[PDB]
Design a protein around this ligand. Structure first.
Ligand SMILES: [Mg+2]
Ligand SMILES: [Zn+2]
Ligand SMILES: [Zn+2]
Lengths: 1160, 119, 99, 118, 90, 50
């Protein structure tokens, strides 16, 4: 016995046509005058666009005239002027209407791609439907003689037919004529007779229009909307506050264009009303009616036909539709220039004093009034406005464990916004931890970040348990660590290794920590010698715990002292015995996988501190003598120019092909470039001589530059090769290469010519960067738009099938193995063992248990693994079938947000993708995801049969192959162009290659298989990331491909109507509920269909979600026609409405409310 | 034929949606702001089938359409005008005479006059 | 720049200033991607309603802050209520029914 | 000055949808601030003001709290005068004004309303 | 637990549910009957609840059950007024 | 508001029918005035300082 009539919680929103009476329901009065505000009193006119009696009062609680002022009469209307004295926000929510004389056609339901009023009526849009309502050619409204039912007549034909019969087939013209047409139309009887006629002896020569319209008519009739509402007779009015005319600075009002529109339509409508009472000349009245049509259409949606101008502005007027067709500012926020903060931890950030003071204003107020100090709220305001010492301490209390989340401009992935504990800093710049300085892709060139203050309690906990930096150790894209130490610190730890012979060395042994005392007290060096010490190692096995292991290993001073930082566990020493390069991150990774979060975090802070400190102690610099040039430079250059000289002489005397000597001489200079490069590196690498004991030995150069290169720290081979070696082949604006490479280098002088040559490379480099940077996000938007609705649900379903994972082997003819693509993956079922037993069924491949997949030798290189591609889930993703790859080490928590994180991880490295039988680059990625047919698609054998020619060029034609065997034939079409690969008589299998060219994903999915096409997409999209050298897990690719294969096509006979291509969601859930419902014969078999990202994203349940990205004027219209309703499970549509997101911290709420909406 | 064959055969699929192409390969008076939206609506989005929904739908201005019906001149001369005006006065006269026939119109005018003199 | 609470535009009740304070920072699509990725439902909730353009919400939650209660008590943003009125201003009708 | 006021009526005038800074993308009507609304700070101070007064009239007597409350008209809508209060309390005019002043005398030490003043 | 917060997820899986329950308890502390179990040590209610969850006390079923007892305490102990009202409209 | 009417009644009314809109140096910045200037309307009482 509920049935509440108030503004409570809603479970869904409904969209449909509006009856004239439906408009009257919103009407709080009727606009009747084009008047807005008074010319002198500046007061709302009587019945104008800004009435007070109709809409709302100007001032809050005082009426128009002034008979009533204060809260005494908040429910009673005024005597002199019926002005309901409530609020002024009432003026913002009140509707109102205008009631037109002659009917008017709604511009949307009239001319919006398909003519809704036309297709519903079966009548040409801009041809007939225009000429019959623009007062030109009269139309018929049903005749029982000579004339049909919807034919078009001229005035002459009208009077002729009227004379022949008349007074029994009367049919007007114009708007009301189309009204009587739609009104007379019987949706029910037509829905029957159309079904009858459009099924009688007709092949595929008609079925198109038949199925189309019948589905459309059935939809409209079942929608509930009456076709009468299509053209309106009562036009509603927008609230005044949503289109106000507010006085700016010193007069000069500011109004909305809608006021001009409504004023025009009101004027034209009034004249029409007046003409329908005075003398009524047909030309005059009909013209004014067409003008009313103009005004109404211009108000609803300009678009579209010339665009009504006026308003002095040469620009058009922003109609209603243009205000809803196509960035959320927020309080408690700020931004500033960022700065490095070495003394910070990983969970801390430097927040400026004055900045944090203004940010936590309301918190300071509350805490002040709570303790004492400030007698009242305004006292607190005055107390903080006059920064009075004690207030700062109170601030030190409010920001204590109150997380503040930071954000950078280009937010590519989840790690764009990370939370920190605010640390007050005497300054006006925002300091950041140098470890998470890579996740933001932030530099200190002058980049500036923004800060947000989690106000809500659960918002603070969300920031601490999710967005906190300490929880984001690993990258969501690849399992590898993301807060890994960078340039400065890594060069430091690289210097803390680097075993140098002798030089204050000798093997004076001690025990770990004591070595520190040895280092500070000089005497001994630091990079010697090697030297031996006692290392107390710790290891665990089987029953965990800890097992000591004291020994005597030969490390160095640096390794000895550095060992102190290493946590309890770990293999110890051997992780330090190496150096500082990539194992610097490997060490962090292993530490995380064998210890945990906290030990890894503190280890990260320690290694950062260590790196910085010892790097500072080192004092590595970059003098001009650090980049030593090879002596053989001029030699190699002369030799190369000698060879090219001979080639040019040969070209002079004919001999060699002069047409392509350009290429081979380029090979000469290219070889020479590699010669200079190899010479420079082999020199600058080792060098040195030292003098160990009895002198004479060789190590590796301590040449600063090399130290930077052999330890990450921004220093690559190519860059160094340009510094001391030579800048190789340079590009030319033509796209060609110049046959005179930059012989000189930056260490040397650079001639004006070759610099004017290199300027092209720099120009196109920056330009191309500017393109791919925006193009990357341009792809990301499509990825998110298509994927941001699926979330891991229903815990862990059954099913065992899944793509057989195998090491990506180009080693067929080039040798290149990668076998780490299986880890944190849930096993399909006991994937065998050269003997028996071993692997369990649903056992997720651990990080230590994937290392067990090496104890089964190189024999086992194939494992079946559950993936998101398969998974017999319905509207989500099985937790098992997904994996675990997060910043978290465990499996994904039930109700995460796989879609967005997948899209982000894919489109994040897009910044470093070079756009162009190998396209390659971001464009290649786009084409693979869009699933576009190649420029020269190959062909496959649909059914295994016997290959034979089917009439040599007898069409038409063009060759024909016919693989026939067992039963029934097939006739494929070969267009002569491009050869073949299978002679006549030979047999083929189900999906064999008979064109040896580019494969089409549609054909692969349609014939080869889903596992094959998904394997193709992932292994082809990865191959373009291999070249760019960007690590990205296959899980996410499989994730987007999952809903990339969302819909299918049914071919048989079931409750679903055959030709309709529907998603396997409704398909599977309905076929599961039909085998055991009444009969399996009341349902058909479906067929998976490959559709691109855009084509897939285009289709979606919610009309609001669609109204977001795709064309709003279309989606909103068509969704209006059929009584559709969003209810209401998507992310995006649940975001713009401003409620809890059906994922993460939500989900539980949605599940409860979802089950709650089962009672009715 | 012309429009259909040209549009379909050319746009396959014109790659970058080359708009500035077929809009010149169309008849009638050009440079309109009306026919524009009817081409940007078909090309993409509902591909393949939309290109079959275009022709079947393909199988303008207030003032220009106003001068059209005004085109029916039926102009007059001094003779014509005086003629029409004469018919006006004739009709009016017959109406007023028909009012004179009505006695209650006279007596009502009499009653309302006494109301006028009674102030 | 930093802003606790300031002025708002007449059209859309969104933060803006330059007359005494500074117009608040802009969130956006790039950021709501991240918040959805994390699962910060309440963080996005507030960042989309009370923290921005929820007329009564901002005031109610501000009072709850000075009283040291936090919580939220959100509501339908005017940046969607306006959308209702604008769509309803056309011949099309949208209603938010209960259950 | 008549001409001066005349020129303040000219022009439509300007529409909000006018581009200004040419940002992404600017609109004149987007810079127009709302003034009919009150600052959340101001609303909070007003509420705390109600509580403050509601707690200050507690340290008074009935024949003094009611007097000040009814005279200056608070928590009762319609405010009354010396006569309408002097009739409901027998003693008329000067007597009730005496008490009305005595309450104001009482408010010369507390700081709550003092700081709420500004 | 001012740096994970990871130890709490072990006691109750799904970091999201962790946030919900922890916010629930933190709400109980910030407004209403405070009474923490783990010593404060100058920590916000945000973290105090997390410290408890890590400690092993105060979970989801725990709060729900204690809420049941809370209702059985407010209702059953003050039923005299409710019954006296029950005889109001017969 | 009644409470505010009482409040000023307790500390002195002086409820002037005027507001306030004086040009103030924005919070944060601080410096020295080097030059003042006043452009008066053509037909307005010139100021003492002007
Ligand atoms: Mg930069
Ligand atoms: Zn009134
Ligand atoms: Zn599954």
């Amino acid at each position: 016995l509920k049935a509440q009539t108030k503004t409570e919680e809603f479970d869904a929103i409904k969209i449909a046509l509006a009856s004239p009476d439906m408009i009257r329901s919103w009407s709080f009065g009727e606009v009747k005058k084009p008047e807005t505000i008074n010319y002198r009193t500046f007061k709302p006119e009587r019945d104008g666009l800004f009435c007070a009696r109709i809409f709302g009062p100007v001032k809050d609680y005082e009426c128009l005239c002034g008979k009533y002022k204060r809260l005494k009469h908040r429910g009673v209307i005024c005597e002199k002027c019926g002005v309901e004295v409530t609020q002024t926000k009432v003026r913002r929510e009140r509707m109102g209407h205008i009631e037109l004389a002659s009917p008017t056609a709604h511009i949307w339901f009239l001319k919006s791609l398909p003519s809704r009023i036309g297709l519903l009526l079966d009548m040409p849009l801009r041809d007939i439907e225009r000429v019959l309502y623009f007062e030109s050619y009269v139309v018929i409204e049903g005749g029982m003689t000579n004339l049909e039912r919807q034919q078009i007549l001229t005035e002459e034909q009208y009077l002729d037919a009227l004379e022949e019969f008349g007074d029994e087939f009367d049919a007007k013209m114009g708007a009301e004529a189309i009204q009587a047409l739609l009104k007379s139309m019987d949706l029910e009887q037509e829905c029957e007779q159309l079904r009858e006629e459009l099924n009688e002896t007709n092949s595929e020569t008609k079925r198109k229009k038949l199925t189309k319209r019948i589905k459309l008519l059935e939809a409209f009739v079942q929608s509930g909307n009456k076709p009468e509402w299509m053209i309106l007779t009562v036009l509603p009015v927008l609230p005044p506050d949503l289109r106000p005319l507010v006085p700016l600075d010193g007069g000069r009002f500011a109004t909305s264009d809608l006021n001009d529109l409504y004023r025009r339509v009101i004027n034209r409508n009034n004249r029409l009303k007046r003409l329908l009472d005075l003398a009524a000349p047909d030309i005059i009245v009909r013209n004014e009616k067409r003008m009313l049509q103009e005004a109404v259409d211009a108000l609803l949606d300009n678009g579209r036909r010339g665009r009504a101008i006026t308003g002095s502005n040469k620009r058009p007027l922003k109609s209603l539709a243009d205000m809803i067709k196509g960035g959320k500012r927020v309080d408690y926020s700020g931004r500033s220039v960022i700065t490095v903060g070495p003394y910070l931890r990983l969970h801390q950030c430097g927040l400026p004093k004055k900045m944090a003071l203004e940010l936590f204003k309301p918190f300071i107020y509350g805490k002040l009034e709570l303790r004492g100090l400030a007698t009242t709220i305004k006292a607190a305001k005055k107390m903080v406005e006059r920064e009075e010492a004690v207030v700062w301490d109170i601030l030190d209390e409010v920001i204590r464990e109150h997380p503040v989340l930071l954000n950078r401009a280009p937010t590519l992935h989840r790690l764009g916004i990370q939370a920190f504990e605010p640390v007050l800093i005497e300054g006006k710049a925002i300091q950041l931890h140098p470890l998470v300085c890579a996740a933001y892709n932030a530099d200190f060139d002058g980049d500036q970040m923004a800060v947000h203050v989690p106000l809500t309690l659960e918002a603070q906990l969300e920031a601490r348990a999710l967005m906190m930096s300490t929880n984001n150790i690993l990258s969501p894209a690849n399992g590898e660590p993301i807060i890994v130490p960078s340039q400065d610190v890594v060069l430091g730890l690289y210097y803390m290794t680097r075993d140098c012979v002798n030089a204050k060395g000798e093997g004076m042994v001690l025990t770990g920590p004591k070595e520190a005392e040895r280092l500070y007290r000089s005497g001994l060096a630091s990079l010697h010698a090697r030297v031996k010490v006692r290392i107390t190692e710790y290891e665990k096995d089987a029953n965990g715990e800890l097992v000591a292991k004291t020994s005597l290993k030969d490390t160095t001073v640096g390794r000895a002292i550095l060992w102190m930082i290493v946590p309890k566990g770990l293999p110890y020493s051997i992780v330090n015995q190496a150096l500082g390069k990539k194992a610097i991150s490997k060490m962090l990774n292993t530490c995380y996988r064998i210890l945990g979060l906290k030990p890894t975090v503190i280890f990260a802070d320690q290694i950062m501190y260590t790196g910085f400190a010892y790097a500072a102690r080192s004092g590595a610099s970059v003098g001009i003598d650090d980049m030593v040039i090879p002596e053989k430079k001029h030699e190699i250059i002369s030799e190369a120019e000698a060879e090219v000289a001979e080639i040019q002489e040969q070209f002079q005397s004919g001999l060699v092909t002069a047409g392509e000597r350009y290429n081979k001489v380029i090979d000469i200079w290219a070889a020479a470039n590699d010669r200079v490069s190899k010479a420079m590196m082999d020199n600058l690498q080792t060098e040195t001589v030292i003098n160990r004991d009895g002198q004479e030995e060789k190590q590796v150069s301590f040449n600063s530059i090399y130290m930077m290169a052999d330890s990450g720290a921004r220093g690559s081979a190519a860059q160094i090769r340009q510094l001391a070696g030579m800048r190789g082949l340079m590009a030319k604006p033509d796209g060609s290469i110049i046959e005179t490479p930059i012989t000189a280098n930056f260490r040397e002088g650079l001639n004006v010519l070759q610099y004017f040559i290199s300027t092209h490379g720099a120009r196109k480099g920056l330009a191309d960067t500017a393109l791919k940077t925006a193009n990357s996000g341009y792809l990301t938007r499509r990825l998110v738009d298509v994927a941001q609705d699926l979330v891991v649900t229903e815990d862990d379903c059954g099913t065992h099938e899944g793509i057989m994972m195998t090491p990506v082997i180009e080693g067929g003819d080039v040798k290149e193995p990668l076998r780490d693509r299986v880890l944190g993956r849930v096993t399909a079922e006991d994937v065998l063992k050269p003997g028996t037993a071993d692997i369990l069924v649903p056992r997720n491949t651990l990080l230590h248990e994937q290392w067990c997949d090496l104890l089964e030798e190189n024999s086992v290189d194939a494992v079946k693994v559950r993936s998101v591609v398969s998974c017999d889930t319905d509207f989500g993703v099985c937790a098992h079938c997904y994996g675990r790859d997060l910043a978290r080490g465990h499996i994904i928590n039930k109700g995460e947000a796989i879609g967005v994180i997948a899209a982000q991880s894919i489109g994040e490295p897009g910044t470093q993708l070079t756009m162009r039988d190998i396209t390659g680059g971001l464009p290649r990625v786009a084409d693979l995801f869009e699933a576009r047919r190649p420029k020269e698609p190959a062909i496959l054998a649909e059914i295994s049969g016997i290959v034979s020619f089917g009439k040599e060029t007898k069409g038409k034609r063009r060759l024909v192959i016919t693989p026939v065997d067992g039963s029934d034939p097939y006739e494929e079409m070969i267009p002569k162009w491009r050869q073949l690969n299978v002679f006549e008589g030979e047999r083929v299998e189900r999906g064999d290659v008979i064109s040896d060219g580019p494969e089409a994903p549609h054909d692969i999915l349609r014939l080869r298989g889903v596992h094959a096409v998904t394997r193709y997409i992932v292994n082809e999209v990865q191959d373009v990331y291999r070249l760019q050298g960007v690590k990205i897990n296959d899980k996410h690719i499989e994730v987007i491909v999952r809903q990339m294969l969302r819909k299918a096509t049914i071919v048989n006979a079931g409750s679903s109507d055959f030709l309709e291509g529907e998603q396997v969601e409704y398909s599977r859930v309905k076929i599961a509920n039909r085998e055991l419902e009444a009969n399996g014969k009341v349902g058909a078999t479906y067929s998976r269909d490959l559709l691109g990202i855009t084509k897939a994203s285009l289709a979606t349940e919610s009309f609001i979600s669609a109204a977001s990205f795709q064309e709003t004027t279309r989606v909103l219209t068509e969704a209006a026609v059929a009584g559709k309703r969003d209810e209401l499970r998507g992310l995006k549509e649940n975001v713009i409405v401003g409620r809890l997101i059906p994922a993460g911290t939500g989900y539980a709420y949605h599940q409860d409310r979802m089950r709650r909406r089962a009672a009715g | 034929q012309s429009q259909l064959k040209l549009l379909v055969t050319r746009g396959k699929e014109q790659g970058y949606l080359t708009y500035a192409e077929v809009n010149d390969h169309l008849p009638e008076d050009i440079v309109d702001s009306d026919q524009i939206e009817d081409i940007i609506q078909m090309i993409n989005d509902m591909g393949i089938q939309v290109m079959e929904e275009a022709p079947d739908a393909d199988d303008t201005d207030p003032v220009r359409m106003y001068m059209r019906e005004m085109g029916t001149v039926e102009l007059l001369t001094r003779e014509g005008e005086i003629d029409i005006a004469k018919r006006i006065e004739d009709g009016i006269n017959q109406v007023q005479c028909s009012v004179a026939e009505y006695p209650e119109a006279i007596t009502y005018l009499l009653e309302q006059y006494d109301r006028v003199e009674a102030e | 720049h930093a802003r606790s609470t300031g002025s708002y535009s007449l059209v859309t009740q969104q933060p803006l200033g330059g007359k005494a304070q500074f117009g608040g920072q802009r969130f956006g699509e790039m950021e709501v991607w991240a918040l959805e990725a994390y699962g910060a439902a309440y963080t996005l909730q507030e960042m989309l309603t009370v923290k921005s353009d929820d007329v009564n919400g901002r005031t109610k939650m501000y009072k709850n802050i000075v009283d040291g209660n936090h919580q939220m008590e959100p509501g339908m943003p005017e940046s969607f209520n306006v959308l209702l009125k604008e769509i309803r201003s056309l011949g099309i009708n949208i209603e938010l029914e209960d259950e | 000055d008549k001409i001066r006021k005349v020129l303040k009526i000219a022009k439509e005038p300007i529409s909000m949808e006018t581009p200004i800074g040419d940002d992404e993308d600017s609109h004149l009507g987007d810079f127009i601030e709302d003034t009919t609304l009150e600052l959340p700070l101001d609303s909070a101070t007003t509420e705390s003001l109600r509580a403050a007064t509601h707690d200050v009239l507690a340290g008074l007597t009935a024949r003094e709290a009611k007097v000040l409350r009814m005279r200056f008209g608070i928590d009762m809508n319609t405010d009354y005068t010396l006569e309408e209060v002097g009739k409901q309390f027998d003693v008329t005019r000067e007597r009730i004004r005496q008490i009305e002043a005595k309450a104001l005398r009482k408010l010369r030490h507390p700081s709550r309303s003092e700081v709420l003043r500004s | 637990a001012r740096v994970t917060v990871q130890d709490a997820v072990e006691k109750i899986g799904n970091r999201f549910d962790l946030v919900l329950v922890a916010a629930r308890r933190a709400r109980q502390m910030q407004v209403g009957g405070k009474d923490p179990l783990v010593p404060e040590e100058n920590d916000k209610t945000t973290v105090i609840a997390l410290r408890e969850i890590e400690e092993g006390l105060i979970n989801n079923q725990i709060l729900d059950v204690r809420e049941r007892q809370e209702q059985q305490e407010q209702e059953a102990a003050e039923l005299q007024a409710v019954t006296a009202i029950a005889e109001g409209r017969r | 508001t009644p409470e505010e009417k009482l409040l000023r009644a307790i500390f002195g009314e002086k409820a002037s029918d005027v507001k306030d809109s004086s040009l103030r140096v924005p919070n944060g910045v601080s410096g020295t005035v080097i030059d003042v200037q006043v452009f008066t309307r053509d037909g307005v009482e010139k100021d003492k300082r002007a």
